Symmetry: D2
Subunit: 383 residues, 4 copies
């Protein structure tokens, strides 16, 4: 039953994903020295200023002027003829520090893996459409621009200044992907490149090697780079702030995504840590037999680490009844907040990368390493 | 089978909304001198500062320093131990004024109606779930703390500083409406009101005579601020950020959401303007009997008028098989970008009411009026 | 009786003189549209931000983002490889606007050329050592860098990025300048120029044509460009704010300079307008006979446009007694504040230039046009 | 012959000083972890904001956000209708941390004592004009509103908000000391005190028992705030600015002043450090009988230890003909830059007391101690 869904992934580059980078990048050293830190990181960016604002609390003492500077080096904005160089661009910073004690915090927490957390409604999903478990669109969006960040940096094309937007559409007939409608990839590029050669370059080294031609029709629209030219890119003309690029980070479109800001929270801010657990259970369910597609919802108000809701659903997919799914899950991996810190050893430095390419997708994440998966087949049956 | 859900909200007090309000307020005040300006602003607010940074094209001159200022005025913030006073509140303009022809990022159509925007994805969702064709957990969340305001200006309960977060937690059975499981208010109270004291006048006056009394279980969990001492609130401690609470700005958690910029953009920018129109399509596709819970996707590509993908699920409940109506929409809801503009009488200041309390929700703004409805039933067949 | 005094003039370029430029440059259009405006203009500059802050009040409505941008074009900071380009450098702005009425102002003013002004102690001086009336050092400081801004811009040397510091020393034996000890001129320059050629270039096209060799010894030290190289210049590594480069603007060293911020005040701020009158009388006295060297002091508290003090002194120079000097002066050109606005027609746009090269010195200033000069000889005698 | 003078001052309340205070406070707090850091900061303050922007080299980590904050605390600003509260006051770091070797601008000597700085000019001036060898119009200005503070913390007159401008207006005859002509206080008063009411407790308690009563004419003009309603004061309306009140920071108006950076620089930067030392030379060259009103110039050139010009006028009154003592100084006051450092025991936090109320003025800081004095009299001849 015919559908053609779409998704956008923007690469590190597009100002919102810069922010995400500075944000967590203050967070990583402010964690590496003190993983018990509470930190958030609302970076604003545009034109000449990276404002790294927000509130911290660690033993650690992170330098911000270079953290900020440095990842703007890293993603590659270096002379003005692009649009803000890493190095004559002010970092200002308005980080409110409270002091590092334990007691009157924004909750109070006391036996360790009980009693805790804050307000937000975090969904999870994984599904079998893909080789690893993410909906087919955001994958062949994210991947696409991830070859863009391979094929600038290494020296393959010398010309793709890295603010790249990349959209993709899949002709959803049934359960499977029969077709894939239009690949929209715009990429910023030097004054060197006449468009016909970019129109050519993109399709060799960025697109064709990562779109599986077995789907690729003779209906499928290449829309590479459509508005004239792109030279000035990154904040030079536009404005960009922390992670309101929030769909692209977690199932581009397909995620019931219950209000939630991803990068730059330490892991006691539940909107993030708790929601990774919502992935860890969903995938862990899916590839292990118990259904063709799994989604969870988990939800907390402030305080009660006894979680206010577990809305598991499959949409006509399940192995046992919809109820026994829930049943198994609950007994198997507790999602009280300081609980999920523990399950997958979170506060040690895995962050710069969660900003930029896929917050879950690359098989090296604590939330992504499917493990207590094959331990689900056994209580369903041996499957 | 049965489910629980949750849907948060924040008042005109929560930093993120206060910011968002200001950005819509500059959008708005830019339109009063003319509507045809492209204009996006983004604020960041916290502590002692609001920076209204953005890129504006317009012949309007509006002095942002006033607009920021009496907007924070309209949120009640005066004697500073209420978080930040809107008299000392610093104000920084970083809005880049471009006049009506040399921008980076323009290029266009021939008649008005064939133009094209920048790219992305948008959805909208209806349901006679409750009154309006909102999925009324976000709505009973919202409505509940629509009353925090009513109170402040109406004198009656006096000590409420502006902030309100909230979660309604409904349980749901597979049809229409079962019972409340939990409901919470966090208002930031006066210094003067005793903790237990506050709870009750809340109970017997904010919460109940909003939140619809038929469903009241002997186990409806009632969290009036399990923290209590919400007092240094407002724009302190958590920072502002324009255009972040997108979910509670759009459809409980019940929304399939696109990445994106609801507040702070003129109705060219099809981030917002497609996803307003996708309630014009949704409410209507319910309102005329032909389903009972649509969600139509729209997407667009930059440098194209003809959109790239449009899909109206029907979570069951379709009173026409399917590709019939998805021609009907194609027949009389011109999804071409500038088309929408003219469809939704969108070029007017209208907008500062948006940032507040659902964009679609309230019966006023043209995005929920049942205009094109019986014109479908008699069209998809003649019934 | 031997002395060797020094002075520094920095060119437009050195961050403090940038500021001075942005400052008055907001002031000129905010005057051109409304000369009755009160405006001040504390621009901060460093690295990536020009902050143009301060308070205004006009009918006018000056754009600031381009004013700010534009004079950073003007003095020539254009690609990053210098240190902040005019155009990916944020201008932010925090200009506090009051509204344009007349009554409760920071004084109250009522018949026109009476009753008025504010607190400050403004000295004036002119003397005969120079062709026009300024002490010999600041002249052969200012002039020097003013050939630097001729010999970059025009295309003579293609290489002097314009943040130039220039110091000069005069062997003061008696009343006259018998000698001139050391010309210290550092100038910023491309990676093109090996120093020996700069060491050569400077002495042809910048120094020798403007130091009168008739003084120039074979003792006189050229100190051109001494710390290694200068490439990055202007705010790129240092920080710069409005007119605290305050000696160089008014008799580099030799001015009793009674506390006072020059650029970017409109002319009801007495520290500036009133003090120009302190020049208009001193020069007007000097070249017209009545003494070899004249200095005045004038001084006001807030309010009483009847000026609290007139400390005229010559230091053993006078034609009549020191007293009759005062006597003539008083009868001749009144220095109540709204008085001196009038004498020399000040509020019409002469400002961008008062920041940068000499606040008095170039023979086209209202304060500098000596006129009621020859009308002093007559009441002394016919001399 | 006779003269009038004037000398202003501002308290720890006037914006410019409040800023200056903070910048010296960061300088200071940077020295506590080590003295050898080059460090310059500059603040800008106003309304809701303090940005401590600057360039620091140091191994110290000091968190500016605290230092700015409890400094504005120490200026008394709390309940916001007193101008700006120092709890909501936003704080922005733009201090560029460089570690101990690759800077733009270093290059140096071989022993410590032959090093060189950046360039400029400095003067210092003594007189047993009144007690200390200050020209005590700035001093009776200063001293007078040194008492505004004494009062606030001592409880007695309570309603004084922190701001004080002031002008003493002395008349002078050609020798020692004649009569007061005028004296004014602008304090910013409470909302509560009646205008006439305030004047008198001012009169009979701030002004008199500072300002030395012998000289009290039947015509000493007494301006207690001819404006009266000074109330919205502090850092509002006129902006802050680090390092601007240089005259009232240095020598009435009676100072020959060099351009420059008294507050906010470590004692390398011979802006400040030469002009502290030129009171060590001045006070001393008076203190040992050999003149009664010196002013020695020093200057330096960048890339030279040996200074470029040094001159000790004697406005008459020289008890040694001249070039004799100007060898003596050359003999035992090593004016070579790092020399001074070691001469003036300058590498210590000392400094936040400086920004307040004369740099030289008070008998404590080594810049007014009569160390080398009788060691001259017996040296310039043996008397």
């Amino acid at each position: 039953a015919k559908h053609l869904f779409t998704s956008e992934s923007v690469s590190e580059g597009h100002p919102d994903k810069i922010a995400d980078q500075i944000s967590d990048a203050v967070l990583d050293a402010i964690l590496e020295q003190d993983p018990k830190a509470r930190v958030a990181c609302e970076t604003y960016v545009k034109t000449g200023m990276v404002l790294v604002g927000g509130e911290i609390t660690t033993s650690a003492w992170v330098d911000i002027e270079e953290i900020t500077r440095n990842t703007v080096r890293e993603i590659g904005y270096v002379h003005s003829d692009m649009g803000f160089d890493a190095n004559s661009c002010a970092v200002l910073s308005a980080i409110g520090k409270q002091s590092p004690d334990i007691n009157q915090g924004v909750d109070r927490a006391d036996p360790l893996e009980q009693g805790a957390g804050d307000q937000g409604l975090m969904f999870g999903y994984a599904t079998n459409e893909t080789d690893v478990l993410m909906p087919a669109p955001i994958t062949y969006a994210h991947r696409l621009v991830q070859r863009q960040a391979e094929v600038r940096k290494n020296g393959t094309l010398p010309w793709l200044r890295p603010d790249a937007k990349s959209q993709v559409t899949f002709q959803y007939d049934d359960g499977k992907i029969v077709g894939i409608d239009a690949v929209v990839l715009s990429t910023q590029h030097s004054e060197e490149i006449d468009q016909k050669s970019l129109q050519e370059a993109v399709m060799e080294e960025i697109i064709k090697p990562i779109l599986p031609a077995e789907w690729l029709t003779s209906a499928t629209k290449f829309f590479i780079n459509p508005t004239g030219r792109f030279v000035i890119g990154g904040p030079m003309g536009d404005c960009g702030l922390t992670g309101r690029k929030i769909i692209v980070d977690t199932y581009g479109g397909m995620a019931r995504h219950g209000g939630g800001a991803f990068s730059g929270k330490d892991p006691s801010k539940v909107d993030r840590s708790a929601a990774y657990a919502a992935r860890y259970v969903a995938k862990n369910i899916v590839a292990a037999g118990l259904a063709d597609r799994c989604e969870i919802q988990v939800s907390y108000a402030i305080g009660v680490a006894e979680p206010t809701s577990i809305m598991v659903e499959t949409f006509g997919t399940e192995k046992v009844p919809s109820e026994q799914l829930t049943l198994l899950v609950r007994e198997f991996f507790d999602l009280r907040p300081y609980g999920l810190i523990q399950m997958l050893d979170l506060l040690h430095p895995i962050y710069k990368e969660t900003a930029a390419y896929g917050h879950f997708g690359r098989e090296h994440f604590p939330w992504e390493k499917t493990d207590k998966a094959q331990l689900l087949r056994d209580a369903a049956g041996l499957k």
